[PDB]
Each structure stands twice: as C-alpha cells, then as structure tokens.
Amino acid sequence: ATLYKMSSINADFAFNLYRRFTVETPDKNIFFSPVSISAALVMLSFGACCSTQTEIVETLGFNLTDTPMVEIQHGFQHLICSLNFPKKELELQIGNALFIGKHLKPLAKFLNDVKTLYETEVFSTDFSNISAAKQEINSHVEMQTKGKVVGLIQDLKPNTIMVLVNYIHFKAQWANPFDPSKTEDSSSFLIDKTTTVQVPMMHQMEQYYHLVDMELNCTVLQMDYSKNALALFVLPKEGQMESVEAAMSSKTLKKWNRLLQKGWVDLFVPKFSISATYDLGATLLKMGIQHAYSENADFSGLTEDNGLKLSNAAHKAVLHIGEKGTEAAAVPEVELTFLHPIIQIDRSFMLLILERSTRSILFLGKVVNPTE
Numbered sequence: 001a002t003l004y005k006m007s008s009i010n011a012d013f014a015f016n017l018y019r020r021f022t023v024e025t026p027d028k029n030i031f032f033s034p035v036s037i038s039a040a041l042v043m044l045s046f047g048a049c050c051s052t053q054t055e056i057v058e059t060l061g062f063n064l065t066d067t068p069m070v071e072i073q074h075g076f077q078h079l080i081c082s083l084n085f086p087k088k089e090l091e092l093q094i095g096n097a098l099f100i101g102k103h104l105k106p107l108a109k110f111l112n113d114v115k116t117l118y119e120t121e122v123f124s125t126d127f128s129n130i131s132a133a134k135q136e137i138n139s140h141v142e143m144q145t146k147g148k149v150v151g152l153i154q155d156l157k158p159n160t161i162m163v164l165v166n167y168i169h170f171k172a173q174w175a176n177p178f179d180p181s182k183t184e185d186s187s188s189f190l191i192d193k194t195t196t197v198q199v200p201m202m203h204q205m206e207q208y209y210h211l212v213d214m215e216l217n218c219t220v221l222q223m224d225y226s227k228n229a230l231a232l233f234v235l236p237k238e239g240q241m242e243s244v245e246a247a248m249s250s251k252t253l254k255k256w257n258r259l260l261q262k263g264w265v266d267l268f269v270p271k272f273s274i275s276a277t278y279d280l281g282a283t284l285l286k287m288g289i290q291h292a293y294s295e296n297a298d299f300s301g302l303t304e305d306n307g308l309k310l311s312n313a314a315h316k317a318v319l320h321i322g323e324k325g326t327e328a329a330a331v332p333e334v335e336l337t338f339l340h341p342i343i344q345i346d347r348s349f350m351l352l353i354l355e356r357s358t359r360s361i362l363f364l365g366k367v368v369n370p371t372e
C-alpha cells in the first residue's frame, strides 16, 4: 500500500527537484536518479528527530497525516528490497552511504538498522585531509556501481562533518535492440536554435507506444528494456521545452499512461552517454531541508555525541544509450512495408527511465547536448 502512495509522491519530488536544477543551470544537461535521492534522504531522516526529521520527509513530498513516519520508513525498506532484488537480464541497485567525521560516534542501533533497512553503509572519515576523504568516498561509490560512477564527489569545504552520498547501478537491454548496421554517424543534432552537434543516430522500424500531446506540445515515445524498466523520450515542439518542463508531474505521467498507443514508428535515436554531478545542499535547503544543515540539527537517533550535522549531500548519475541497451556489447543476429511515421530525436529532449513494478523514476533528465 505505502509503495503505491510513494510512487506519485516520489515522481512529483523528481519533477520539482528537476525544475530547481533548471533554475540553477539554465539550458544545460540535467541528469539524476530521483528514487535514489528520495531513498537516501529517507535513510538520513531515520537518524533525525523532531523538525530535523519532519523537514526531510515533507520536503520529499510526504504528508505525515496520510503516511505516518514509520510507514514511510518501512515503505522505503520495501522499495529498496524490491528494486535491488536480483533479476535475470537486469542489474539494478540503488544505494547510499554516510561518511562521518571520526570524532563522532554513531549509535550501533542506527548503524545496524539502516544497514538492515536500506543497505546503507556508514564510514568514519578524517575530513582534515580533503583529497584522501574524496578518494575514500569515490572509491566506495565506484565499487558499489561496479565501476560505472567515477568521481561522484568533487568539492568538500574544510570543517566537513557528515557527507551523504547516493547512487544507482543500472544495466539493461532493450526489448528491441537496434541493428548496428543501420546506425548513421555524424547526424545533425540541434543543441539550440542555431547550433548543431554531430552524433551517431541509431535507426529502427518497429512498433512503439507513443503519443502526441496537444496540451503540452510534445511527442512522447516509450522504449522498453527487456526486464522491468522502460525509457520515455519526451520531444518538445519548437520552443516548447520550458512549457514541457513546467508541466511535468505525476498527473502528467498518469495522463500519458492512459493515452500512449502502439503503432509502427520509423525511429531515429541518438547513441550517446550522459552524466551529471550535484551537490544537492543548495536546492534541498531551498526546498525545505534546513535543520539538518544547521548547528541545531537533531540527529539524536544517529548519535549521542554533540555536533553532528549534514555538510554535503552528493550525487552523480551516468547512463549510456546504445544499440543493445546500457552496455556497449554486441547485438546477436537472432535478436533482430507500408509508410510509417518518423520520430527523429535530433534536438534537445527530456528523458525518463522508469521501473514498472514500483513505478519509480530511476533516472530523469534533459539532454540539451548529447556530446557532453
């Protein structure tokens, strides 16, 4: 039940956070894992008390009258268990960790609870050595992501006390892989009104769920992975990116779920990779997480020691889109005449990667320029 309520709330948080990012960095690539951020902040909240705690979950979009705190905590336990369960043909792990200055001692019950509930690991770190601390954090993340997310954290100020990190590991195959013999190099991709970049353009004629949204002035194309997950490509009409961004919400996803229809599409999709790195504090504080960052932070559920507060919450997300899926691997031959409409993704678009069993947003972003 809680898992069901969480989907809409987590999606609205995703889009609200996305909009915060557009105002921090206008007209630049955006790419992050909403569900991983949500889960990490619920974990952090598990060690917080009073307003420090309620600020976090309310900023995530929850109403404590509707979903009591313990229900949220257990709903996210169930979510992580579900997403991270081993599945054939899909690797999916969301995860997080805390790095805490060595002078502060976490409560053993907290450590054991968050490992059990959320798979979280917690490390004692000497933040007086900034380069060493960054390497420790980044090595942890690189190992947890089987090497895919490298250099997640880039900046730490002196007097760092606690760092939250969150990440996602994702490996998947398209239900309908592209034939690499049809991939065209150096196709033109508009990164703004007048500027083009050259990108390889994959090409497949197949049946896809898609729609033309007359209200929001965009075309939506659904491409399934072979297990659990799917991609939505959101292609705004000329000059309509801003109106699309403003409209994205859990209500919009519900509308599209109903209106998507299947048919033949002569489809052209760029082959590319995207990444982005964030220090989330700026946005999260604006969105309402204040006490956790202050000298009055109440982390009594985390430690009996005085002086614990959040210093930084860091996140990096990366994804490849290629002929097979997420991996640069061969497409076996076995796995591959009326006039059909063309959808050509040759200009800036929004991208969602969704997980079906839990209705989580694994990745959300805007591809302004696919050639980083």
Ligand SMILES: N[C@@H](Cc1cc(I)c(Oc2cc(I)c(O)c(I)c2)c(I)c1)C(=O)O
Pocket (backbone or CB within 6 Å): 007, 008, 011, 230, 250, 253, 254, 256, 257, 354, 355, 356, 357, 359, 360
């Ligand atoms: N129809 C197919 C394909 C599909 C899956 C998902 I996941 C999705 O994204 C959401 C996200 C939220 I949040 C919702 O409340 C709803 I309804 C759909 C959409 I669009 C389409 C299915 O379900 O397998």
Ligand SMILES: [F-]
Pocket (backbone or CB within 6 Å): 175, 176, 177, 334, 335, 336
């Ligand atoms: F196939």
Ligand code: NA
Pocket (backbone or CB within 6 Å): 174, 175, 176, 177, 335
């Ligand atoms: Na296949």
